[PDB]
Nucleic acid binder design. Structure first.
Ligand SMILES: [Mg+2]
Ligand SMILES: [Mg+2]
Ligand SMILES: [Mg+2]
Ligand SMILES: [Mg+2]
Ligand SMILES: [Mg+2]
Length: 1312
RNA sequence: GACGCAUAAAGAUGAGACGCGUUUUAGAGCUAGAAAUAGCAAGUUAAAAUAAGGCUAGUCCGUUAUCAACUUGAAAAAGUGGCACCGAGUCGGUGCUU
DNA sequence: GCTGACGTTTGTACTGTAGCG
DNA sequence: TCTCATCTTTATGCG
DNA sequence: TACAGTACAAACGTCAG
């Protein structure tokens, strides 16, 4: 009667296996529905459900924010048009209509075809006078004439459309900073108190050297105008009031409280951004762009003359062929400037007079475009200065730009603050803003319509956890003083001490804990036990010596926020006071909640009577982040109604009982537990309601559906035991501590081994090293990874994190794939690894970092990947590590959901009866089981290995449970300790083996029949149970099912493709015919439908009846589902039989002659649908012939298994016979099978390892799913893609229940 | 014998932005030709769109998640498939039983 | 007369190709 | 790619 | 890995003798 279930859950699979108490997998004669003659089927209850992995929300969000940016950009353009509109209608009743109809063709345009001036002649005298937008911008700035509104609009609209980044706080301005005479003002100012630096690469290393060549009064002065100095101590040689000085990031008023800094800092930074002020202008960016254009002009004039006078045969390939990455491909084709440079540098090396061009290419100046990937370095304030200059000229002639100058000034610089979010009116699930009035939001009225404070508080409050114990209560800040006290008293209530006189160790009394906290947790940020035993036990308790226990040599707990508030609020008795504790809690809550200084000031204003303004100025810089696991109500709001204390009171003092948070909230004697359990629907609603990524919701829901379907199979009786394989681990304590070493020590060891003084120049703390940019800065020893340039620790936003292998090629967000680099160097390696030249020029420095172990060997391999520079689809053959985290999350959730679904009956004696015992095995047990008794696992043959893992999980779990029911609490849900646990869980499996072998060669014979002790019952018969599991491993029928999935997402490929007279292009906008305008291509089919209809066919048209697949794209899907028959008639189908329309999602399964199966991948592609049931002997041979020298066993055990391969050399040929018979049966790639046979015969003499480690690849020919390329040694086999779908229209369609047990089979031959 | 403390790795969710890129159009091509084009000149920029679109019309929403088939149902949701044994190349046979 | 010659006029294999920092 | 914020899982140390 | 670009092979009229 009884049965059990095993589950193996992966990112793309769940394996499931019902087992009997005998460890046999059962089978039933299942009824099958549908029109076919077949009425019942024999099926084993072992299988695997296969589904494609769920996508994370990343791509959808990166499209959503882009959609918002384009909407807002067009609205900026519209407010500009609104200001310009009554005036533009004077000079041009249709200019905005012409910029709008710019995209259309000449006869589609209602107005004359030239966008800006309309007429041809003025549009060309225009482009002759101003060849780009920047000659326009410059002429507008430096000249003082009355100028054309249509061109003001274009200059402003261009700057408003492409406005540059906002990563610089406040503003830069050129007008205070154009002229290098500021050093005279600086020395004149210090007496009250060229390009000399900038001619070389900017860092302190050059700046000090130059100024000493030209103590403190010059260089130490000027760095405070130029650099974010590292010491926190006060300055020297300084003003009459003495404090620290640096060019601080957010607010230089934090340093001025000790003008020329603004002038000189803007001058140096703008002259670092722009190669300007060797010439005097008022429009520096436009001047630089015009200099680029003129240099490009003279360079091309030189270049073509050189090419014609020395290599005239070469010209067309460079300058006309737009496919070659020549200049034609650089301009008219798709080539970048890197591709053009590597194209053109060999040609320049052999010509004469090219030295200047070769010099310019090495600086990246050679024939630059004006708009490039590195324009993301340009801040918006430069554009802001140009727009201000423009308006300040024109206002003398345009009264209306005088009247509303600041509205246009507002429109470019307005950015929605990130804490406010999308400006909805209630219908956006992403919106959290609250608006004061129902008025429409503009950049001008934004401050009076939107309540920024409430929205900014709600921004955090929507995201921070509810307390897991009190789900209606939001958690504390991490740094809240209540949480500090909670943490220290939670830790210190459980430490124990003993002296020479005492019989046994004793807890700290409440007096002692209070004394320790006030003594040293309030006078040291982190306390060592050395500090505890000296400063408390030796100094207060006067002990000669003491042993302390319950804590490592450094305490985990801290009162660091007390130290902060003590440095700020000077009255220590204020911080130790009871009355003001709520106010201090509000201060730290605000200071965690808000980072914008104005709302910090506006929130803290209510307490300005308790502290001075100097303290308040100190409080508003003390930014905090992070939130505790617990709510205020939990830790000090609720009281046990019998005793009267809160949790924090108990942690402060609990007599000698000294309970911590756990034993408190689990003691029935304290009504905390009653408060918890009174503070504490369908499957799909529950699965939607969980937190975390949407990606994991797929694998959880499908396996819960699988388990419920299995329960439906077994007469609605529940299983005794459910075994879930967990992606969980045990380690030795030394390995696990090494696996989690503090990341400061990683830096210190490597820096000491390479011997640099960077930590003397830039000291840093492990709390600070949690920042990703800063961690990378120290890992790289202060230098860029792509040019030999000293990085700046203050400017780490203009440096950016390159992913060494790009995310578009491979998802890898690890430190081994991250590089901090200058933004231009990162964006100059779009979709690639670093180039060959950069590997050649820096492989030595990378080797110095590798030898010093700041980078891994994997990181060195990714950096030097151009030495192996494939980046092919065949290089994907290692798992992305995201699949492990998803597996862990899914299996963790499914444990608690299946426990909640199975064990539902509450009881008053004990709370919940285990009707079903849900089990969560770590994978090491099943892995050791597989490797000990030669039940090996090869992932490349076929998909049955998922079901075999579930079978072995159920077998091993039930065997361990029935062998050790005393050890039920180690598996059922609800030298170092870790090393002892690791050896215990290693040795717990010894009951499966007949012999136990010691390291000295001793052997112990174990019984052939295993039993438990406490009831003597048989569990593991090493005679017949191993034979039984070997029988179940050799079944040829396993219910593999691929989930039928309607596709969602992008309508097409994203690339927009040029116009052509082909009807397959997707119309990219409703009125834009793609024969004229181009459009998208590669559409994605949501599902096929089987259509049966007439069609008008033949050159003399006549109705022919037809049955075929129609691929409903995602775009057209809703129109189809509104009303099918008119959609089919629009597609051209006539007399359609409505009831015979069959919906066919992706991977709809069909079966054909000789057992052949095909999965419908679209209306015009199939996929191979059968699975090779290869016998176990050849599988274990393939695993042992693979892995041949790298087996983990002893040399004797390696040898005997390596000989097992040699004993079965003839297995190689019979595997090829197996693959031939199968491929002929199901795959039908006869040319590929002949190529496979011929290549095999080409290499039948090569080593049996290399043969097997390539026969393992031939199963790509046979394996289920999409045809994919594979290779056998040198020979590469191209995929035999099943682009024909003609056959499935008369196959039998198989609709599979989610396990694959029940079926509906439709014989489509009878349909038509 | 699943929880908050410290550490670390790998990931995730949301907001605000930047740079590109593509597409069509605009930037008069010229000269020589029966010619298809060839020589030569040119090129660097801009507008518009950037999922088709949608109705609550917002400076909002539109690529995540949910889906075998069939009977009920607006949908949520509920419902629908005998067992034992001997065998095994993707499931077969045998016997009870409804 | 009526088999087949000779174009047009559709229907099948093979290589490319895909938004990204 | 940037800025800002929050959160999950797993592993080790202390209860 | 599904579809796109595109080089390649059967089928369907009017001549052709
Ligand atoms: Mg597994
Ligand atoms: Mg999806
Ligand atoms: Mg990059
Ligand atoms: Mg698996
Ligand atoms: Mg721990």
């Amino acid at each position: 009667k009884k049965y059990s279930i095993g589950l193996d859950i992966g990112t793309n699979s769940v394996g499931w296996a019902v087992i009997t108490d005998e460890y046999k997998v059962p089978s039933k004669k299942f009824k099958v529905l549908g029109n076919t003659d077949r009425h019942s089927i024999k099926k084993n209850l072992i299988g695997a459900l296969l589904f494609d992995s769920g996508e994370t929300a990343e791509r959808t969000r990166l499209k959503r924010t882009a959609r918002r940016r384009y909407t807002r950009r067009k609205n900026r353009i519209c407010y500009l048009q609104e200001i310009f509109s009554n005036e533009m209608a004077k000079v041009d009743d249709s200019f905005f209509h012409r910029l709008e109809e710019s995209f259309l063709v000449e006869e589609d345009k209602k107005h004359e075809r030239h966008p800006i001036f309309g007429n041809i002649v003025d549009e060309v005298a225009y482009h002759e006078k101003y060849p780009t937008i920047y000659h326009l911008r410059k002429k507008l700035v430096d000249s003082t004439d009355k100028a054309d509104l249509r061109l003001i609009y274009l200059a402003l609209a261009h700057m408003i459309k492409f406005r540059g980044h906002f990563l610089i706080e406040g503003d830069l301005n050129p007008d205070n900073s154009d002229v290098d005479k500021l050093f005279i003002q600086l020395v004149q100012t210090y007496n009250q108190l060229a390009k000399a630096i900038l001619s070389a690469r900017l860092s302190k290393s050059r700046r000090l050297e130059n100024l000493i060549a030209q103590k403190n009064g010059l260089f130490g002065n000027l760095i405070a105008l130029s650099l974010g100095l590292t010491p926190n101590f006060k300055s020297n040689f300084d003003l009459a009031e003495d404090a620290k000085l640096q060019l601080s990031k957010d607010t230089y008023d934090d340093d001025l409280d000790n003008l020329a800094a603004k002038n000189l800092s803007d001058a140096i930074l703008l002259s670092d951004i722009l190669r300007v002020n060797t010439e005097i202008t008022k429009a520096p960016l436009s001047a630089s762009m015009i200099k680029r254009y003129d240099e490009h002009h003279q360079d091309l004039t030189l270049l073509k003359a050189l090419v014609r006078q020395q290599l005239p045969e070469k010209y067309k390939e460079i300058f006309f062929d737009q496919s070659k990455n020549g200049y034609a491909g650089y301009i008219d084709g798709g080539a970048s400037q890197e591709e053009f440079y590597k194209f053109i540098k060999p040609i320049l090396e052999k010509m004469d007079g090219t030295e200047e061009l070769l010099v310019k290419l090495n600086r990246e100046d050679l024939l630059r475009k004006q708009r490039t990937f590195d324009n993301g370095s340009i801040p918006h304030q430069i554009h802001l200065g140009e727009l201000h200059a423009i308006l300040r000229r024109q206002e003398d002639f345009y009264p209306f730009l005088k009247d509303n100058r600041e509205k246009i000034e507002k429109i470019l610089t307005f950015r929605i603050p990130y804490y406010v979010g999308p400006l909805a009116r209630g219908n956006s699930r992403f919106a959290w803003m609250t608006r004061k009035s129902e008025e429409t939001i503009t950049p001008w009225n934004f401050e009076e319509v939107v309540d920024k404070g409430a929205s900014a508080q709600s921004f955090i409050e929507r995201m921070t956890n509810f307390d897991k114990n009190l789900p209606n209560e939001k958690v504390l800040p991490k740094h809240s003083l209540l949480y500090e006290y909670f943490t220290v008293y939670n830790e210190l209530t459980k430490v124990k001490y003993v002296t020479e006189g005492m019989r046994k160790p004793a807890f700290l009394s409440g007096e002692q804990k209070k004394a320790i906290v006030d003594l040293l947790f309030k006078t040291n940020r982190k306390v060592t036990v050395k500090q505890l035993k000296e400063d408390y036990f030796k100094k207060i308790e006067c002990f000669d010596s003491v042993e302390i226990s319950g804590v490592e040599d450094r305490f985990n707990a801290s009162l660091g926020t007390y130290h902060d508030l003590l440095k700020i609020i000077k009255d220590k008795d204020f911080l130790d006071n009871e009355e003001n504790e709520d106010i201090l809690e509000d201060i730290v809550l605000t200071l965690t909640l808000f980072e914008d200084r104005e709302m910090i000031e506006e929130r803290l204003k209510t307490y300005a009577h308790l502290f001075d303004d100097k303290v308040m100025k100190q409080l508003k810089r003390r930014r905090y982040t992070g939130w505790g696991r617990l709510s205020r109500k939990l830790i000090n709001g609720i009281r046990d109604k019998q005793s009267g204390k809160t949790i924090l009171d108990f942690l402060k003092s609990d007599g000698f009982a000294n309970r911590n948070f756990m034993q408190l909230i689990h003691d029935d004697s304290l009504t905390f537990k009653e408060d918890i359990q009174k503070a504490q629907d369908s499957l799909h609603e529950h699965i939607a309601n969980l937190a975390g990524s949407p990606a994991i919701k797929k694998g959880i829901l499908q396996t819960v559906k699988v388990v419920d379907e299995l329960v439906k199979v077994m007469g609605r009786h529940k299983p005794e035991n459910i075994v879930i394989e967990m992606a969980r681990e045990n380690q030795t304590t030394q390995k696990g501590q090494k696996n989690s070493r503090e990341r400061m020590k990683r830096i210190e060891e490597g820096i000491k081994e390479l011997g640099s003084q960077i930590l003397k120049e830039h000291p840093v703390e492990n709390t600070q090293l949690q920042n990703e940019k800063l961690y990378l800065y120290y890992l790289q020893n202060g230098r860029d990874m792509y040019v030999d340039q000293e990085l700046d620790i203050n400017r780490l936003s203009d440096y950016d994190v390159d992913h060494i292998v790009p995310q578009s090629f491979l998802k890898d967000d690890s430190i081994d794939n991250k590089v901090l680099t200058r933004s231009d160097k990162n964006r100059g390696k779009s979709d690639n690894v670093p180039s060959e030249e950069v590997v050649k020029k820096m492989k030595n420095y990378w080797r110095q970092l590798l030898n010093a172990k700041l980078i891994t060997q994997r990181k060195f391999d990714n950096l030097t990947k151009a030495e192996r520079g494939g980046l092919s689809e065949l290089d994907k053959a290692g798992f992305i590590k995201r699949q492990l985290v998803e597996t862990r999350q899914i299996t963790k959730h499914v444990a608690q959901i299946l426990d909640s679904r199975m064990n539902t009956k509450y009881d008053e004696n004990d709370k919940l009866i285990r009707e079903v015992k849900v089990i969560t095995l770590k994978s090491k047990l099943v892995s050791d089981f597989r490797k000990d008794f030669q039940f090996y696992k090869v992932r490349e043959i076929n998909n049955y290995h998922h079901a075999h893992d579930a079978y072995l999980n159920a077998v091993v779990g039930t065997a361990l449970i029935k062998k050790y029911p005393k050890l039920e609490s180690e598996f059922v849900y609800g030298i170092g300790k870790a090393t002892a646990k690791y050896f215990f869980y290693s040795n717990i499996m010894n009951f499966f083996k007949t012999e136990i072998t010691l390291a000295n060669g001793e052997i112990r014979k174990r019984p052939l029949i295993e039993t438990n002790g406490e009831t003597g019952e048989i569990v593991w018969d090493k005679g017949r149970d191993f034979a039984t599991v070997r029988k179940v491993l050799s079944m040829p029928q396993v219910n593999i099912v691929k989930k039928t999935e309607v596709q969602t997402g992008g309508f097409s490929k994203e690339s927009i493709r040029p116009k052509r007279n082909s009807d397959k292009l997707i119309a990219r906008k409703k009125d834009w015919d793609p024969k004229k305008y181009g459009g998208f291509l590669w559409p994605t089919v949501a599902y096929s439908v089987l259509v049966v209809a007439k069609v008008e066919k033949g050159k003399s048209k006549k109705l022919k009846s037809v049955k075929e697949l129609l691929g409903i794209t995602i775009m057209e899907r809703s129109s189809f589902e509104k009303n099918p028959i008119d959609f089919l008639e629009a597609k051209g189908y006539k007399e359609v039989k409505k009831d015979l329309i069959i919906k066919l999602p992706k991977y709809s399964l069909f079966e054909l002659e000789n057992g052949r199966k095909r999965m419908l991948a679209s209306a015009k592609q199939l996929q191979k649908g059968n699975e090779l049931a290869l016998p176990s002997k050849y599988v274990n041979f393939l695993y042992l012939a693979s892995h041949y020298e790298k087996l983990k066993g002893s040399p004797e055990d390696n040898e005997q298994k390596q000989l097992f391969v040699e004993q079965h050399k003839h297995y190689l040929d019979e595997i090829i016979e197996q693959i031939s018979e199968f491929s002929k049966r199901v795959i039908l790639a006869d040319a590929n099978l002949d190529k496979v046979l011929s290549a095999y015969n080409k290499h039948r003499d090569k080593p049996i390892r290399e043969q097997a480690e390539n026969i393992i690849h031939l199963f790509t020919l046979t394996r289920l799913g999409a045809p994919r390329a594979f290779k056998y040694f040198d020979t590469t086999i191209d995929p035999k893609q099943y682009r024909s779908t003609k056959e499935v229209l008369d196959a039998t369609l198989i609709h599979q229940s989610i396990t694959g047990l029940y079926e509906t089979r439709i014989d489509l031959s009878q349909l038509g």
